[PDB]
């Protein structure tokens, strides 16, 4: 069924090279060669996790016939109230080697062995504020011991955690911030999203003045909402046999937000 094929697509995910994303990739590269640690901050729906993920994938791990994989970038995400053991365990799994059973000092010794030899240039920690305050001792330790850049990614709260300790604030003083959509940038996005993500047969033509008012109020500049809203509108719309997104169905969706 043609309709079923299309609904499954719309329910999925994709990466669109937005203006905000291009900047981060170049900034991190600077930091990568310079081998310096830094942090990235911004509001929770700005798409920080995605920009950082897209980056990870542009540097495929490499493999020769003999030695272990060389893995320039490591991306991990902690659990809530992450302890010192939990951080090493995830780094070790990420790199495909598993050590089971021992004490904290053993996970640490083993983490430094897999981080060495195997080239690692950058470690990215998502939701950095899930880290328990003491774990930063182990994050600094690695950052200073090995020539590995460490990047901390998070919301404004992350800085509230960092500013409570001078030892950390100073290693991670440099920062980049993500912002929101506005003005001409919000409009250009909307148009890209229509052609690049929705793809209905009949042009729904949203950049029109009358329609942008609806979207602006509904989304308030967060790329997160903009995506959810236009996808929910094409899916609802197709389920009812329409060939485009109109004004009333868009309002029907926006009303629920």
């Amino acid at each position: 069924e043609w309709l079923q094929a299309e609904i499954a697509r719309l329910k999925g995910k994709s990466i669109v090279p937005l203006q905000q994303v291009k900047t981060l990739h170049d900034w991190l590269d600077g930091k990568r060669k310079a081998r310096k640690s830094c942090r990235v901050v911004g509001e929770s729906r700005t798409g920080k996790t995605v920009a950082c993920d897209a980056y990870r994938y542009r540097h495929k791990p490499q493999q020769e016939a003999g030695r272990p994989p060389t893995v320039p970038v490591v991306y991990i995400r902690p659990h809530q109230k992450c302890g010192p053991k939990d951080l090493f365990k995830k780094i070790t799994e990420y790199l495909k080697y598993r050590v089971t059973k021992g004490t904290v000092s053993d996970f640490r010794d083993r983490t430094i062995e897999v981080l060495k030899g195997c080239g690692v240039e950058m470690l990215i920690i998502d939701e950095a504020d899930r880290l328990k305050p003491e774990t930063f001792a182990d994050v600094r330790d690695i950052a200073e011991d090995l020539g590995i850049a460490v990047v901390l990614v998070g919301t404004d709260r992350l800085d509230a955690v960092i500013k409570r300790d001078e030892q950390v604030l100073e290693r991670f003083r440099a920062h980049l911030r993500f912002g929101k959509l506005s003005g001409e940038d919000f409009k250009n996005t909307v148009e890209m999203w229509e052609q690049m993500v929705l793809k209905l047969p009949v042009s729904s033509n949203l950049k029109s003045k009358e329609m942008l008012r609806i979207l602006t109020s509904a989304t308030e500049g967060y790329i997160g909402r903009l995506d959810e809203i236009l996808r929910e509108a094409a899916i609802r719309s197709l389920s009812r046999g329409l060939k485009k997104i109109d004004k009333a169905v868009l309002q029907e969706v926006a009303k629920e937000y």
């Binding site: 999925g12 995910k13 994709s14 990466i15 090279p17 994938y57 490499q62 493999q63 690049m196």
Partner: peptide, 14 residues
């Protein structure tokens, strides 16, 4: 411009 599918990157992964 190139645009990527989200699962594709995983299918082509190192």
């Amino acid at each position: 411009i190139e645009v990527w599918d989200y699962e594709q990157l995983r299918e082509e992964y190192g």
